[PDB]
Amino acid sequence: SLWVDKYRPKSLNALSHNEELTNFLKSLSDQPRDLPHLLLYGPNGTGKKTRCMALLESIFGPGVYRLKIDVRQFVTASNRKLELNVVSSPYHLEITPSDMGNNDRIVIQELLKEVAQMEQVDFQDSKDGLAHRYKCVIINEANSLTKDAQAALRRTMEKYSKNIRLIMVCDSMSPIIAPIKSRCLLIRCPAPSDSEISTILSDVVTNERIQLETKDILKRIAQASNGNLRVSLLMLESMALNNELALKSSSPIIKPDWIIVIHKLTRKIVKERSVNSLIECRAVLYDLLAHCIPANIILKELTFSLLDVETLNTTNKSSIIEYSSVFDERLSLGNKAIFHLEGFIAKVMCCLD
Amino acid sequence: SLQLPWVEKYRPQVLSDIVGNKETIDRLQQIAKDGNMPHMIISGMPGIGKTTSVHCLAHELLGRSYADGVLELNASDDRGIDVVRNQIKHFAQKKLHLPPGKHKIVILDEADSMTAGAQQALRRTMELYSNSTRFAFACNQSNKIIEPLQSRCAILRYSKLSDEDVLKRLLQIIKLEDVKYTNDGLEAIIFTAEGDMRQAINNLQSTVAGHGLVNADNVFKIVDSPHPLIVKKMLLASNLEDSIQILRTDLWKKGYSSIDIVTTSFRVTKNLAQVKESVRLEMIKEIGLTHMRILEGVGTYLQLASMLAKIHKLNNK
Amino acid sequence: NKFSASTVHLEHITTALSCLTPFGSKDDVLIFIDADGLSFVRENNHVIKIQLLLSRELFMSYSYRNETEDHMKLCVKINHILDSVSVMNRNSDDIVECTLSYDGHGSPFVLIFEDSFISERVEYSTYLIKDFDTNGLELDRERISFEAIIKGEALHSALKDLKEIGCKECYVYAKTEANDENVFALISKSQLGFSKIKLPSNRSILEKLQVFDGDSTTVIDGFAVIGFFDFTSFDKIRKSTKIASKVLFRMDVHGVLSVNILSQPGIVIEVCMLEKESIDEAAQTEIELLMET
Amino acid sequence: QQPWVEKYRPKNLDEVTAQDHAVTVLKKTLKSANLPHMLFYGPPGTGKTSTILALTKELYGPDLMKSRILELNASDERGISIVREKVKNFARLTVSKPSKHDLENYPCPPYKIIILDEADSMTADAQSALRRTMETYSGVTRFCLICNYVTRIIDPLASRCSKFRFKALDASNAIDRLRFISEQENVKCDDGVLERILDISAGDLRRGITLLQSASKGAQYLGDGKNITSTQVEELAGVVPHDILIEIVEKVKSGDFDEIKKYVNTFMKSGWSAASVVNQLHEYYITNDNFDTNFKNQISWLLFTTDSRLNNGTNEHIQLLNLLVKISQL
Amino acid sequence: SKENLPWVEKYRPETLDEVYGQNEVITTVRKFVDEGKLPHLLFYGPPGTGKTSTIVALAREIYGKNYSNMVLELNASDDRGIDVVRNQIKDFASTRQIFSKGFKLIILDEADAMTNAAQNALRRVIERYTKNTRFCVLANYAHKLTPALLSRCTRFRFQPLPQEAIERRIANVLVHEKLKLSPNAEKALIELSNGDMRRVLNVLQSCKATLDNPDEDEISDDVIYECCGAPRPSDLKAVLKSILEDDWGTAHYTLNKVRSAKGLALIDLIEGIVKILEDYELQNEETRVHLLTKLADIEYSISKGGNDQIQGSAVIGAIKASFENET
């Protein structure tokens, strides 16, 4: 398997990147009967899902990693077979309602309500139990729920709290409505420091010999990962296999292709500011959108690449960030992203000229 | 309790009693006296005499054969693809011994609400049986009838009824009913009618029933001035403190809903004159943002006051 | 319980239910409980009403211990009853003894099906009663213009013929000639044209036709009463004439046709129907010409 | 046994704290039988659901509740067909006979209650199809609408429903209820705590109860027998430490775009919520006496715009950087 | 039976003499009934003005005890699609009236929720069977009705209820409920009514429930404000004075103290300050433009939630910055 999954902490004691967070998780798992609904939020790739699985392993014991995929089928108002994969475990369930689109309301209203209605009585056990009495449902990407699946959950996880518990993983919990955040215990997961990422990469290159020339090459990957442990571990494997398992100080850091294309677009915007350049930028944006890359991330990386240009004055950057905020708000409240993604670029070139 | 309303009691029975659109009514009279009626589409705003013209033409063209020579179908009757294929086909295939130049008439009232498949089958229906029966479509918006159907028809567009034809018909009804009036009351009735005969007759009937004498005070205390003309006055104000005064006194305390004011403002702005296009598009944008705010739940007076303030801000700049 | 009724001839209460379905297949049905019998009344669009009656003689036991009120009204859904008594009737060949029960306002309507082994018990929820009163749609018994007694089979065949010819609209002609002749016809407007079904003047099909001058007392000859009806309402009695021995037709000057169907004891069916405006007054003369033709 | 938010849910109407203007009115309807149509609206976690659940119990009892109560929430479909069929048929239903025990122990009003919780998520047509349903069968069926945004309820429906506003639960009206829960659970806290919890939880008792439960679960895990301090409460509530906020305002005061951008980039990695740092900056800037009237007037609108953009589900990094750049140029 | 009813349903008018506020509409429909010729009516107005109470009382006056079989009342709670119009309404209009009261009446309540196809099909049922049936259309929004349907209907506008009508109905309610109301409490109730009788009755019922003893106790303005949770007329003026005169710290303290005194929300304070500033003699024409525009955005943001303290500070800053133009 990939080094991101192979070297994954499978227990609460194997976590080694945040210790004030691991202690809070141990405090939560000490008495699992009264565990409230949890909402883990933080940057992407910090280890939020790994920590959720480690907490579930501390609560229900080993075996929560024995995952099987049970394909479900749903029908909306106008008869149409809509399919959702449900990765399930003998003690917990993982669902991604965002994968089915705007119709995640029917998934939340049927699957989650049917799970929350089954008491999970098992053999007797009608009094209580630390495990196997209540159930854990993991809702990955809680941010992409379309404000109606979040309304069907407010009473679902409140009335049926005795037989079900929810642990939802999310980043930047702004599009999560206030009633959902009120019913839940907010758990902040900070990103690992560069020293911690370097230590984890050192452990990886110790278990698998890649012949590290200098400890600085692991630090460069950590600084290029911007706090993303999964990305850092992916670039480690990339520069490992692309250099015959021998990392040198001159080894280039491999970055995603869409990031390079966004940087090229930024340089084109800085160099050429005209209508035809705007049309070429629209072609680049369409090509980027054809790869199912979300438009908010396109705008975010484009803005933070334009703010890194050394030939731009402070007045230009203060206008770029303002246009970025305005068009991000427009993109959030919109249907088609090309209009806003082109308007931001047009205003940027109209300001830089 | 058996007295009919004046709208139906004084519905014209001959083409000579239909005021307004003098040239079109004269042409309908020539069609009635000659007989060779072509396929026709009659369009216009509601209540100007489109239906009472087709029915009177059919009566004056058939007479004793009106019972078996006219098939009247409208929106209240089912007009699917099957009715056209069976009922209309059998009526067209029917052989009736009508005088020379006289043809059967299929009056399809409210043809703008007919489905596309029925309209497409009507193409074959008129193509096969054009020598015996003629079709008379009456609608309010002629584009709702498909172009292949319009190609086989002679389009007759009915214009708005002027203030003189309305006064003539109102005076005829007043003389028939012997009601008391004065000139300003009839002028107010015509002004509130806005080119509508049915509304003018209804307002006159209401005024006579309520008070009896048709003057401006009694007319205006039961009938209201058209709210598009008040919205136009509010949107064309120079300074804000009286546009707000109009919006409050003549639109808010009178009972008009905020969504109604916003929807009327859009149509007023689309037809507003003496305003620059750049001003007009910004006004449309502000009205649309206000419409979104009303539709999202905030139907308050403050949201309309802010819209008027933004309109005045864009006007003065 | 305030009311309890037990029977074994469930085919009677099954045909009674099968006579009610034509008047809508999913709506509320009113049940009137008094000492004389059990009656089901159903109204559609305020233009037609059907009133079957199950007498106390159709039940071995008919207690009705209610004393505070002389009659008890309950409103239940017909779709619940029809959907229920269908799957119950899967093994209807068994000796089933239906037991109706009602304990008053707020209590459900109970329908027990015991087979001496299994006692199925169904409780139907009772709903509030609407504003419309069933006594409005009744003919005035001092204004009858015509009173025809017809057999069940002939009327059923005529209704089935009208259904097969389409019959968007229907007409009823009733003239008594001076000599001895009685004319009763069911003229129809349909896709075909203008079709007429003439009931025979013989006394086996048309037992008694009697035309009055709007007072049900003065029998006159040479004048015909004509009733313009919508066959959508006129076809509601077709399922009731299928088990009818004799059918009584009565109409007043107010435009109400009272169809009386008696089955053989048995269920008594009363259907009241309203008559259309007939705003066009040329079809009347064409009816007269057609009958004279 | 259960989470403290579910263990301490008000069972009766006397356990609902800080809302007396509505509970006093509702208690009088126990002796009478003239309960009107009710519209419960207020901030989240104020006790709207618990109040109706306690009123229903006190009015009917656990046995008559199953027959005299229909509750529809956002977890089930409430379209035009559901409103026009299921709700209308339940309103048209006859009031069931109370038992002798029910009539001898509970008031048993001669009507049923239809509770439409989360009514703000219903469409304008499903709400329009409810007006005559509530009006026609008001003598046999009562309606209770629960929502957070009263603007999402149409004006015709809001006119027919008696409006009950649930006040936000602050440290002045929920401190006794929080102290009761602390005492029954034997939670040891310093002086000042249980007020900082209610200050962080702005108008929400559910979040404060969950915060206290989370603090206790760490306090008994440490096993030192020491009182819970406000620092731990702020740490586990997501509140940014004051040193970091002072660093933010010092970086803002310099006004250099690049250093503020780098600090925001290294701050977003710590996982802090934008709605919390913006709120803390609001308290820092508005209450400070070192800023003039013009600066406060401008920054009030800047913070309002930033909060409004953040509430719409936008990128926190971009909004926070733009806000700090705008303050740096004020 | 009628004593276990909400006051908005218990005090529903049964005759045309109990409908207040709308004098010109009633004095017209009564003459229409007296002559016996009732045209096709259209009732338009704000919610809680008395349109349904007027039409039901009118039908009862015309039909007496035959209201059940002579009136077909279809509203938003029933399906009113194209098939319903083409079947139920058409057979109700086409059939005879058993020679009871001459003409039939079809009341289409909440016709603004009706689809355009049904409203277009109803046009040839309204003007064809008008000899035996009359249509009454009740609506709150006229923009959802087709222009032809508006053309074939006599429009009567139901104005918001005047203060005198509210006082006359309040007197009857107080007499029936043996309640006492102070003149200032009546003033507060009428200003909070916004021309709605249903709100008046709902607030009066809650005020009676609020009283410890329903008799021998008078409902003051304090009781009404406590029950309905509205700011007192002095709190709004104090907040406005603090914002307009005091500095940014004292105004912030005064707003928070006023709000925490009685748990006052921000939206009602915003509306009260807007109403107080409406009758202000501004002299710049930009103070009003900035005030209305900023307060409308704050009001819209409150409707979608967010941080309350930030919104309060935004209100204070918006007022302070808008009044900087005036001087």
Ligand SMILES: Nc1ncnc2c1ncn2[C@@H]1O[C@H](COP(=O)(O)OP(=O)(O)OP(O)(O)=S)[C@@H](O)[C@H]1O
């Ligand atoms: N030119 C006219 N002269 C006299 N009465 C008229 C005239 N135009 C309309 N009316 C009156 O308007 C009423 C009905 O007019 P219609 O012809 O049915 O309306 P319309 O023009 O067909 O509009 P629509 O689209 O059918 S609603 C009757 O009372 C007529 O008397």
Ligand SMILES: Nc1ncnc2c1ncn2[C@@H]1O[C@H](COP(=O)(O)OP(=O)(O)OP(O)(O)=S)[C@@H](O)[C@H]1O
């Ligand atoms: N006044 C109160 N007294 C006691 N507990 C309260 C009070 N208000 C809220 N709570 C607690 O808050 C938690 C949730 O209350 P609910 O009423 O169910 O939520 P809510 O008010 O409906 O908010 P929603 O569902 O987001 S609209 C429970 O643990 C209650 O015990």
Ligand SMILES: Nc1ncnc2c1ncn2[C@@H]1O[C@H](COP(=O)(O)OP(=O)(O)OP(O)(O)=S)[C@@H](O)[C@H]1O
């Ligand atoms: N003029 C009035 N006189 C007395 N009571 C009134 C008056 N208008 C309204 N009411 C009361 O307010 C209640 C509701 O008014 P309705 O007439 O039923 O509804 P409406 O006024 O037509 O508003 P909509 O459009 O239906 S929301 C009535 O039952 C009365 O109790």
Ligand SMILES: Nc1ncnc2c1ncn2[C@@H]1O[C@H](COP(=O)(O)OP(=O)(O)O)[C@@H](O)[C@H]1O
């Ligand atoms: N404490 C840790 N020690 C070693 N590796 C870790 C640790 N935390 C996270 N990782 C690595 O990070 C990778 C991705 O983390 P992930 O759970 O996807 O984070 P998030 O849930 O924030 O997306 C995992 O494959 C795991 O190997």
Ligand SMILES: [Mg+2]
């Ligand atoms: Mg017409």
Ligand SMILES: [Mg+2]
């Ligand atoms: Mg709730």
Ligand SMILES: [Mg+2]
């Ligand atoms: Mg109404």
